[PDB]
Amino acid sequence: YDIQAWKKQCEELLNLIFQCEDSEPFRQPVDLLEYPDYRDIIDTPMDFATVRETLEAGNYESPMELCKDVRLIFSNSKAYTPSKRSRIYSMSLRLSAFFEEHISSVLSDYKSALRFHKR
Ligand SMILES: COCCNC(=O)N1CCN(C(=O)c2ccco2)CC1
């Protein structure tokens, strides 16, 4: 029933993601000097440092909003990859499974707590 607990839970999950080698490609913005066409394909860049800064700034209201931005990291990788067997895309899929496994209880607890609050 703690409707604020999602924020520390998301901080801790981001800490786990940053320790994970599969987050290597996703920790900071794509450099257009390395990938000159990146913004020709990707409309809305996202990375985990941006997600963490948004959280720490107090600019997420709910864990659903954070989840939308994290999912955008993964959909950007799927859109940019020239192969479904690329190194970086393959890393994105494992990291996505990890994130979804861990965010499930954060979303459930928040939605439960908020329903209780509004009862
Ligand atoms: C060390 O990380 C530097 C920042 N990241 C980065 O440059 N990226 C990450 C996003 N990305 C892809 O998802 C992708 C799919 C297939 C090839 O790349 C493009 C490359």
Q: Which residues contact 95 (CB under 8 A, 6 or more apart)?
A: 17, 20, 22, 23, 26, 74
CB atoms within 10 A of CB 29: 11
Find the 103 Cα to ligand 1 centroid distance in Å. 23
Distance CA 84, CA 17 (A): 22
CA-nearest residue for atom 10, ligand 1, is 77
Kindly state if the Cβ of 23 falls inside 6 Å of ligand 1: no
CA atoms within 13 A on the CB side of 17: 30
Which range of residues forms the domain containing residue 58? Answer: 1-119
Give me ligand 1 centre to Cα 87, in Å: 10
Structure tokens at 86: 């690329």
HEC assignment per residue over 75-118: HHHHHHCCCCCCHHHHHHHHHHHHHHHHHHHHHHHHHHHHHHHC
Spatial distance between the Cα atoms of 111 and 101, rounded to a whole number of angstroms: 17
Number of structural domains found in the chain: 1
Nearest to 23 by CA among 56, 55, 46, 39: 46
The approach used to solve this structure was X-ray
The two three-digit tokens of residue 36, written as one number = 């000159």
Contact between residue 78 and residue 117 where contact means Cβ atoms under 8 Å apart: no
Are 112 and 63 in contact by the 8 Å Cβ rule? The answer is no
| Protein residue with least CA distance to atom 13, ligand 1 | 77
A 10 A CB-CB count for 20 gives 16
Q: Is the CB of residue 30 below 6 angstroms from any atom belonging to ligand 1?
A: yes
| Residue indicated by tokens 């720490």 | 56
Query: What is d(CA 66, CA 13) in angstroms, rounded to the nearest whole number?
Result: 11
Q: How far apart are CA 109 and CA 119, in angstroms?
A: 15
